[PDB]
Amino acid sequence: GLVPRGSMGFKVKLEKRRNAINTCLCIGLDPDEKDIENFMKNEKENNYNNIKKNLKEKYINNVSIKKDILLKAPDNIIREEKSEEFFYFFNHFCFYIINETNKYALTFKMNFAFYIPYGSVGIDVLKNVFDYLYELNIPTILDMKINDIGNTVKNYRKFIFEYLKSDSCTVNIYMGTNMLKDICYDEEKNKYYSAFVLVKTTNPDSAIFQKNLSLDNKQAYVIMAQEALNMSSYLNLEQNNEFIGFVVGANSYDEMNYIRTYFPNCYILSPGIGAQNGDLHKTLTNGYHKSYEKILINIGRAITKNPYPQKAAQMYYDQINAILKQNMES
Amino acid sequence: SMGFKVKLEKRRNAINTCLCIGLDPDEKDIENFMKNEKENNYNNIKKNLKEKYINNVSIKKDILLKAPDNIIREEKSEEFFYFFNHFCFYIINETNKYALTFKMNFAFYIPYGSVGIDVLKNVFDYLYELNIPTILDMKINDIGNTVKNYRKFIFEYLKSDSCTVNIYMGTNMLKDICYDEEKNKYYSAFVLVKTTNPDSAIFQKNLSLDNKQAYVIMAQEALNMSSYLNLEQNNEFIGFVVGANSYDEMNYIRTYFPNCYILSPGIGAQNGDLHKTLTNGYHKSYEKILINIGRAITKNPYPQKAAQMYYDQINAILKQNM
Numbered sequence: 001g002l003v004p005r006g007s008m009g010f011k012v013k014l015e016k017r018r019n020a021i022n023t024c025l026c027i028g029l030d031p032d033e034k035d036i037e038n039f040m041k042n043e044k045e046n047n048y049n050n051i052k053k054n055l056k057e058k059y060i061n062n063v064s065i066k067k068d069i070l071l072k073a074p075d076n077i078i079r080e081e082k083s084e085e086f087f088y089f090f091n092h093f094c095f096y097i098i099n100e101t102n103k104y105a106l107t108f109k110m111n112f113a114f115y116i117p118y119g120s121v122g123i124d125v126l127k128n129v130f131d132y133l134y135e136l137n138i139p140t141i142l143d144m145k146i147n148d149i150g151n152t153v154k155n156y157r158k159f160i161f162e163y164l165k166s167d168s169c170t171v172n173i174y175m176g177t178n179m180l181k182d183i184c185y186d187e188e189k190n191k192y193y194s195a196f197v198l199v200k201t202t203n204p205d206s207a208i209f210q211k212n213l214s215l216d217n218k219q220a221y222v223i224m225a226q227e228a229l230n231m232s233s234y235l236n237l238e239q240n241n242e243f244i245g246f247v248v249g250a251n252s253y254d255e256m257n258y259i260r261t262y263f264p265n266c267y268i269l270s271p272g273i274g275a276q277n278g279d280l281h282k283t284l285t286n287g288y289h290k291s292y293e294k295i296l297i298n299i300g301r302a303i304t305k306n307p308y309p310q311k312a313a314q315m316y317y318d319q320i321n322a323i324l325k326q327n328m329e330s
Numbered sequence: 331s332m333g334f335k336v337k338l339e340k341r342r343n344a345i346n347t348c349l350c351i352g353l354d355p356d357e358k359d360i361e362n363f364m365k366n367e368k369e370n371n372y373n374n375i376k377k378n379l380k381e382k383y384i385n386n387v388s389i390k391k392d393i394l395l396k397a398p399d400n401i402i403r404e405e406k407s408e409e410f411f412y413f414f415n416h417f418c419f420y421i422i423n424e425t426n427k428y429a430l431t432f433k434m435n436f437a438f439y440i441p442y443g444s445v446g447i448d449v450l451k452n453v454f455d456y457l458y459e460l461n462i463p464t465i466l467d468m469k470i471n472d473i474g475n476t477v478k479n480y481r482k483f484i485f486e487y488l489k490s491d492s493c494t495v496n497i498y499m500g501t502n503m504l505k506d507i508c509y510d511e512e513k514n515k516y517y518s519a520f521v522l523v524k525t526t527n528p529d530s531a532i533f534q535k536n537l538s539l540d541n542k543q544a545y546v547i548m549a550q551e552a553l554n555m556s557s558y559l560n561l562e563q564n565n566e567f568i569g570f571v572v573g574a575n576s577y578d579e580m581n582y583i584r585t586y587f588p589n590c591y592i593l594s595p596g597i598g599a600q601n602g603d604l605h606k607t608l609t610n611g612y613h614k615s616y617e618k619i620l621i622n623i624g625r626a627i628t629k630n631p632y633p634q635k636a637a638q639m640y641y642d643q644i645n646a647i648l649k650q651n652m
């Protein structure tokens with residue numbers, strides 16, 4: 001009755017992990033230039049304490065790109081591999097956050113935008129991060145808010161689900177839901193994949209289209225949620241242990257309440273806690289489901305920019321779990 | 331330092347078209363080029379190697395400069411890189427004299443990992459050297475802090491002139507895409523208004539605000555944000571993606587926003603009507619109606635001739651409209 005790592009649908013992988021660690025913390029890994037630069041500076045000041053810990057972890061030997069470089073001594077990188085120094089410290093920063101925080105994470109979400117601005121080098125890092133998370137068996141989300149015509153988006157499907165072997169991604173369906181047939185499904189291989197579509201976002205002006213536009217007294221975010229679930233049903237996702245879920249911001253309390261009320265069993269991904277100042281108690285309460293994996297609370301910068309990310313993660317894990325307990329003991 | 335508005339106008343004066351050539355090479359296109367080049371003694375690669383501009387690409391130039399016979403024996407790990415990059419150079423070399431702009435869709439450059447991003451960088455370098463105005467089509471959207479990374483990638487790293495953006499999340503994101511307050515830099519973008527996919531009506535037309543369809547609302551907000559940012563005073567603009575199969579919308583947008591910049595994909599592979607699109611979207615400054623053609627050029631076995639006939643037809647249609 002046992003399924004091996006990598007050989008099950010995302011719904012099953014999330015449920016198993018949720019049973020294991022009893023939380024809905026989603027850790028965001030969005031390293032910026034200052035993060036990387038700082039990591040390098042700190043490691044140089046402390047004889048690379050964290051990099052040396054990274055290098056003892058067994059699965060570093062199972063990443064795809066430039067292991068030859070990643071496994072070098074840090075002082076050899078600095079002295080002998082100058083053109084690889086950035087790749088090295090960027091990738092080791094990522095492994096460091098993962099190693100420090102993974103025991104608290106239901107899922108990691110990596111936002112593509114942070115991995116592209118230096119050109120190809122960050123995509124090598126991103127591939128290694130995904131290979132590493134696959135080896136640890138931690139559920140993954142690639143946050144890329146993708147959108148195009150079907151013929152174009154199948155390239156993103158290949159990158160996200162074949163190359164990175166991601167469990168899921170985020171999608172903006174404003175163009176249409178028909179794009180989902182080329183993202184959540186591969187007709188050639190007959191494989192199904194999971195996604196979170198944008199419903200209500202955290203940016204301060206998100207109401208401008210998501211709540212102002214309507215059809216017959218239903219606001220755009222409700223229509224968009226319904227259309228996404230209609231497409232999920234058509235594609236048979238949940239019967240293949242995948243899903244289409246919703247991104248609903250952690251500062252959008254009324255919309256979280258409406259979505260959980262009107263779509264009782266939907267999967268919700270909620271960014272906005274920490275750096276963006278959303279209210280965790282209100283968000284988790286309004287979006288609560290007794291299957292906690294259906295209300296992922298994403299926290300990025302408030303963990304990754306803390307000097308002690310393991311402790312920051314534990315603190316959020318504990319805060320979330322205390323609110324989960326309040327709801328279980330309602 | 332020209333500004334995209336100025337780049338477009340000056341190039342329009344030199345080549346007298348509004349053809350925008352799409353460069354979206356897929357795996358089959360690359361494999362076909364490789365196969366064909368092998369069978370025809372690398373005729374096009376050899377032509378590529380004679381062009382001056384190749385000497386100015388940033389990434390792995392020495393690889394790109396090697397003879398194909400040598401690449402396949404002594405740099406085999408670089409074989410895909412080499413043929414992918416050379417396909418792009420071949421298309422650009424064969425068609426550039428007919429292009430007001432080139433538009434590269436990011437999705438085609440990512441699915442193999444980092445390797446395609448090096449190709450994409452070299453492509454922007456090559457176009458920059460040819461001083462051809464550029465668009466990165468990536469339909470970006472996120473919160474402000476996140477999209478700054480796309481501003482850097484697109485406008486600092488690639489040095490693109492412009493990009494496409496999806497503002498459904500909100501318009502304020504444009505402040506962190508089309509503007510860099512630190513450096514006092516301004517950049518141009520086209521925002522999604524009416525798209526070519528067959529179910530595009532579902533949100534763009536069927537949603538409304540006080541009896542105006544969503545696409546009109548979105549277009550107006552994009553121009554509102556352009557005004558706020560003072561783009562046009564800095565020789566830049568926010569414009570509209572309007573499908574070349576969306577005649578009513580193109581008609582309405584050109585009527586209601588008389589001086590707007592439109593990018594129109596959908597001719598060729600997606601069936602759109604060239605005469606109707608150019609007519610409904612027409613402006614005397616015809617750089618304001620970019621007609622994008624991707625696959626109908628790149629998947630044509632005779633791409634110079636395909637580009638030539640779109641150039642010629644656009645020019646006949648432009649004269650009809652005056």
Ligand SMILES: *c1cc(=O)[nH]c(=O)n1[C@@H]1O[C@H](COP(=O)(O)O)[C@@H](O)[C@H]1F
Nearest residue numbers: 028111201202271275299300301472476
């Ligand atoms: C995406 C959608 C949205 O509505 N908000 C939002 O922030 N995003 C992305 O989510 C995370 C937030 O991380 P943080 O904890 O550091 O604020 C980023 O990846 C952002 F791009």
Ligand SMILES: *c1cc(=O)[nH]c(=O)n1[C@@H]1O[C@H](COP(=O)(O)O)[C@@H](O)[C@H]1F
Nearest residue numbers: 148149152435525526595599623624625
């Ligand atoms: C983007 C928006 C849109 O409405 N339609 C559309 O096709 N796109 C992108 O535009 C071009 C079309 O190229 P084609 O000439 O090969 O059809 C592609 O880059 C597509 F992604």
